[PDB]
Amino acid sequence: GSAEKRKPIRVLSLFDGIATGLLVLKDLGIQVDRYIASEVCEDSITVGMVKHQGKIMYVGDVRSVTQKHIQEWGPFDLVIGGSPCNDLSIVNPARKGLYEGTGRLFFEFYRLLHDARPKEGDDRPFFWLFENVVAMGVSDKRDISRFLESNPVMIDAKEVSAAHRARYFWGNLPGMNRPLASTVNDKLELQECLEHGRIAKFSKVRTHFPVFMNEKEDILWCTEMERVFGFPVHYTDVSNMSCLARQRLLGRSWSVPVIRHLFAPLKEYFACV
Amino acid sequence: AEKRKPIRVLSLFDGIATGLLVLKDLGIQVDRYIASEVCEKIMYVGDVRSVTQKHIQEWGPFDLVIGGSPGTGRLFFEFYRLLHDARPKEGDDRPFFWLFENVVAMGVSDKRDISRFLESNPVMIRYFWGNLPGMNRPLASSVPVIRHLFAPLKEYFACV
Amino acid sequence: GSAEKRKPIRVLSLFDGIATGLLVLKDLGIQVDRYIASEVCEDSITVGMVKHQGKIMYVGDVRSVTQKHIQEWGPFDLVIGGSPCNDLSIVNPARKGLYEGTGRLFFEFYRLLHDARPKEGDDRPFFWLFENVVAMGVSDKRDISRFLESNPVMIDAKEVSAAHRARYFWGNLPGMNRPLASTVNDKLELQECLEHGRIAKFSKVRTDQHFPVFMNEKEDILWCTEMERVFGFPVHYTDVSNMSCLARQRLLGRSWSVPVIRHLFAPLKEYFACV
Amino acid sequence: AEKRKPIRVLSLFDGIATGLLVLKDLGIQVDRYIASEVCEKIMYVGDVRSVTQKHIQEWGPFDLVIGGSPGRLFFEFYRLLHDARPKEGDDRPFFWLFENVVAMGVSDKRDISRFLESNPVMIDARYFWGNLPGMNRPLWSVPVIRHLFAPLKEYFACV
Ligand SMILES: Nc1ncnc2c1ncn2[C@@H]1O[C@H](CSCC[C@H](N)C(=O)O)[C@@H](O)[C@H]1O
Ligand SMILES: Nc1ncnc2c1ncn2[C@@H]1O[C@H](CSCC[C@H](N)C(=O)O)[C@@H](O)[C@H]1O
């Protein structure tokens, strides 16, 4: 209810991956004051380091960030994160649950978020987002929704892309449950993502052989995967990594249109280009 | 800083009323004792999954938070949630103490993670974390135990 | 000496690789009627198929192309080729020479070229280019110059790019020996080709115990996009078909330096239609 | 043609005199016989690597081209063949023979058959490629080359 000039957003991204959050914030025209990312895989760090010109301040393992570090590096306006899910997926029979293995990394989030929340009486806007899979144990989902004191929003990227990708999003972002918008940039069909001379067997990919090329079924190429998930073409064409490693990076990533849908209302809260 | 008042305790301990027995053993007045467990004005509230931040706010304020057992992650993380929910707000210098017990037979990953989250290195006896004057420890390289550890509490709260 | 509207060029590319010739012809603004390429490695075929939208008519092994094929597919205005060199380089001790192994592939060129030149009395313009390595046996170079009835022109990509790449070019292209022009598009230094956050040890790269680039106080080899920039190709030009970065490096190593081929093909604008 | 005229021959054969011996053994008149080897008026011209296309033009026209040995020399023979072939539209008679040993790589046999557009004649054991009538095939050496050259008596003058 008071007057001030809109200021650029200050972001803390845990488990940043290939810097989907910064890409989405840039695409929305939101000015990014600061982008401190916690990422441990060197390939993802190289992707984000190259494709954003060292704007990202990398701090490494999320377990090496202390509350004093949050206070000194802060304040932060947005705290986003997507913890590893190999120990949360019911597909994995050797899963260790939410509290063991790599699932307990979630609590790191729950830690730093509470360290980054404005102190009581501070009416400044503050937003956070935590993404994970839907195919987790019901007990794990209940526990996550208990710790975060929020019920998740189920969003499937098949509605704004050519990928079957349903995910749970906890957070306090404005209107996360609002209906998604299929715009003209959205490539809703797998055929729209293929390179020249390839045909798509299915409308939306579920990652058999999804494409036919000159009477010979193939798998999806890497640039086609970038198009499917909404990333710019050759966005992951850095650092001489194997195609399997690039596929690994792209599979753990966020669907760009989904994150754009989630971040769009932030334009009425921060400076915009 | 008013005159000494009776202590208010929140227990997620594996053995219910262990903390209450230790407190009565030291002769400390108890104004409230809320106990809970993990499963899979002195009250037992059952499953910790049923305890919310609003419940902690209503039953509170709390002065002591105890937890542990004589996977280790679930117990500690429930205890950590309750500790965060019961901790005084920044700028409230009122006394607030906590203790977490576990067995020494735990993965080094678990011990280091617990020490990191609690910002405290453990006391070896079993392993014990706490902020009571006495269990401040540098970097590492039966209820009588809790009695001796809780000894400094009678210097901060009213005794009968 | 007579009048006619200049027509688009008809090209036969043997050992085409990643379609460097078509890329250079397009960049110069020359109109391409048709582009028939003989290539056997499927990675190169996928590169050329994707990055030029299926405009290349692929015919496969050069040894499967007959004189009747050259006649029926023709006429052709430009016959270009760069045969494999692993049996011609002196760096290979197991080299089999020009006449055995993969070196004899050269003669396929010499074959099809003679099947493609206009019959005597046909005053129509007709050009051809054959590229190979400098580090080859002197006897092999003399034999190639004998069979092609032309002395080669030595061109090093270092003069017009950031790569050490000296090659022999036999051909009747107009003014092949003319001085090369260093334009503004040319990235003469390796630093100009590196991605963000990397520093170049040297000024120009060579074809061990040297990691050409420093990155954040660590030694690294050249990235694929940086190799593309070094060789003159567009960025992500070889980012197709899920091939290993080693295979991408192999494709880029065998290729022509784009600015060198542009220098060689420039005078063709005065002979064919230009968009 | 005006009449039967004496033959003109270009020999890259290993053994400079073989072609002339076989030609005189069949009684065929010879206006020109020029022999060359691989190294590395009847006349010897030395290394084939010294023979140019202009030399073939000046010494020519040629009616017969022979090469081989009872290999890198096949490509030299093929160069001389291309240089000696009649221009398009010249239906004058022109013949060639290439001999090699049957002990060759199957790759070499296939490559020679491709380049010469002809399948070879097996003679147990040597391979003979040629366009003489009777050398059409589907998929010392003096007497056999004599019997193979036999059809030359019907295209050139005999003494
Ligand atoms: N201990 C740790 N500290 C910080 N990051 C970690 C970590 N362990 C795993 N990670 C990272 O967390 C990521 C989870 S996958 C999520 C990636 C990101 N949401 C994106 O859109 O790209 C992985 O990329 C992994 O590299
Ligand atoms: N038998 C054959 N028929 C047709 N192409 C062949 C061949 N054997 C090898 N090649 C191709 O010849 C190429 C020689 S390397 C030259 C590539 C090309 N000049 C460029 O600029 O990219 C190789 O890519 C190889 O795939």
Residue numbers in the entry:
A (entry chain A): 626 to 832, 847 to 912
B (entry chain F): 628 to 667, 680 to 709, 726 to 780, 792 to 807, 894 to 912
C (entry chain B): 626 to 832, 845 to 912
D (entry chain E): 628 to 667, 680 to 709, 728 to 781, 791 to 805, 893 to 912
From the primary publication:
Despite numerous efforts, we were unable to obtain crystals of DNMT3AR882H or DNMT3AR882C with sufficient quality for structure determination, due to their strong polymerization behavior and low solubility in solution. In light of the fact that introducing a secondary DNMT3B-converting mutation, DNMT3A R676K, partially reduces the polymerization of DNMT3AR882H/C, we set out to prepare R882H/R676K- and R882C/R676K-mutated DNMT3A MTase domains for crystallization, which led to successful structure determination of DNMT3AR882H/R676K at 2.48 Å resolution and DNMT3AR882C/R676K at 3.2 Å resolution. The structures of DNMT3AR882H/R676K and DNMT3AR882C/R676K both reveal a tetrameric assembly similar to that of WT DNMT3A, with an RMSD of 0.29 Å and 0.33 Å over 800 and 811 aligned Cα atoms, respectively. As with WT DNMT3A, the central subunits are well defined, each containing a largely intact TRD and SAH-binding pocket, whereas the corresponding regions are disrupted in the two external subunits. Note that the introduction of the R676K mutation does not lead to an appreciable structural change for its surrounding region, except for an increased distance between site 676 and residue E820′ from the symmetry-related subunit, explaining why the R676K mutation partially reverses the polymerization behavior of DNMT3AR882H and DNMT3AR882C. First, unlike R882 in WT DNMT3A which is conformationally flexible with poor electron density, residues H882 in DNMT3AR882H/R676K and C882 in DNMT3AR882C/R676K are associated with well-defined electron density, suggesting reduced sidechain flexibility. Furthermore, unlike residue R882 in WT DNMT3A that makes no appreciable inter-molecular contacts at the RD interface, both H882 and C882 engage in notable intermolecular interactions in their respective complexes. For DNMT3AR882C/R676K, the sidechain sulfhydryl group of residue C882 forms a reciprocal pair of weak hydrogen-bonding interactions with the backbone carbonyl group of residue M880′ from the symmetry-related subunit.
